[PDB]
């Protein structure tokens, strides 16, 4: 059998920061979504435009698996139609999203005593991201009319900020690993079938 390598996304030992979210393009394989119905492993499993229980009966042109880490209380922003720092400046789903959003608590892997400062999010950006846009700029953010010329100072801020993930955080503020499955159906032969 030629199974789609969803394990490489879901079971990756390390995850990306949300501003630099990872994407794996899945093509030309048999997709077995049975691992999703294994509950007690996922705190969020929400689908849009498809039935969550019928995924094994569906064919798509391609499937995208995006993955990243955010705060628990930010998982609600990974949905069509949402606003907030994550949806606006880090990872944006389209209003007409077709796919599923899966999340689980990763406190045991992604928090550190005194703070894990490796997971970042973009705090400053002049405009919202388009759906599925990925901004990895580290340009100094100009909050006034004076050019920054690459140096931080008043009105001149580094645009990325660290999460302060420590294992004693309240659960809503603990790290969550998120995988977004986008199902792409083009006027073309399907290559990912259940």
């Amino acid at each position, epitope marked *: 059998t030629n199974l789609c390598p969803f394990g490489e996304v879901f079971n990756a030992t390390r995850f990306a920061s949300v501003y630099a979210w990872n994407r794996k393009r899945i093509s030309n394989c048999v997709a077995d979504y049975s691992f999703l119905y294994n509950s007690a492993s996922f705190s969020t499993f929400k689908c849009y435009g498809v039935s969550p229980t019928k995924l094994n009966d569906l064919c798509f042109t391609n499937v995208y698996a995006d993955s990243f880490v955010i705060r628990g209380d930010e998982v609600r922003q990974i949905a069509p139609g949402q606003t907030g720092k994550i949806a606006d400046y880090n990872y944006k789903l389209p209003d007409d999203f077709t796919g599923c959003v899966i999340a689980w608590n990763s406190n045991n892997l992604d928090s550190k005593v005194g703070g894990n400062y490796n997971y970042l999010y973009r*705090l400053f950006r*002049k405009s*919202n991201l388009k759906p599925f846009e990925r901004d990895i700029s580290t340009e100094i953010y100009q*909050a*006034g009319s004076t050019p920054c010329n690459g140096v931080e100072g008043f*009105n001149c801020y580094f645009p990325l900020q660290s999460y302060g*993930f420590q294992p*004693t955080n309240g659960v809503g503020y603990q790290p969550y690993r998120v995988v977004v499955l986008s199902f792409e159906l083009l006027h073309a032969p399907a290559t990912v079938c259940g």
Partner: antibody
Amino acid sequence: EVQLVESGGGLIQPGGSLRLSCAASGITVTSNYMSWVRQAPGKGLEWVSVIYPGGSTFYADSVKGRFTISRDNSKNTLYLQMNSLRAEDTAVYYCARDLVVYGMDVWGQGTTVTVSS
Amino acid sequence: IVLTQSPGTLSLSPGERATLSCRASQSVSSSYLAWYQQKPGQAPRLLIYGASSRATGIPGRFSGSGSGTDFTLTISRLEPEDFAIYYCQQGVTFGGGTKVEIKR
């Protein structure tokens, strides 16, 4: 100089409307998280509303559906439209630039709103 | 998120050390807190951001510390202009304030 100059407060009857303005110099309003914070007589500070640099807006539950935050880039000004005002909206209203991780560093001088019949 | 400041009133003399407490109902991020001073008729003034970083131009006698849920503002040696109300802040939440008044 870096300042926020507020205006628009005054006396209004319950159910009426007022518009507060916060004219900025030294920061670009549309490039910032900009907030309104109010303080009722003798009480503490209460966050009221924020507008993000990209335009998303958020409101305290106590003003949702009644207040609208907005901005005008050409005037470099932040606004708060307050509709269906109530007695308990009586307060000094402050605008402030919010750096989120670096605190609210720049504050307006405050404008007083008194809602009474 | 609820921020609880203690005590409600500190009664101290000039030259004495002031210690003000802010406790958060939840551990959020790390060192996630700002401190403000407010005098009658004036707007609040940022003292401390990121729990421990002094805002520009704030005198060195002001220091902040703490993490998780327990945070402290210290005024190492009170000056007469330091008698005032002090607020902590996290996100959209403010503490209830602590008044520093002159003891006699």
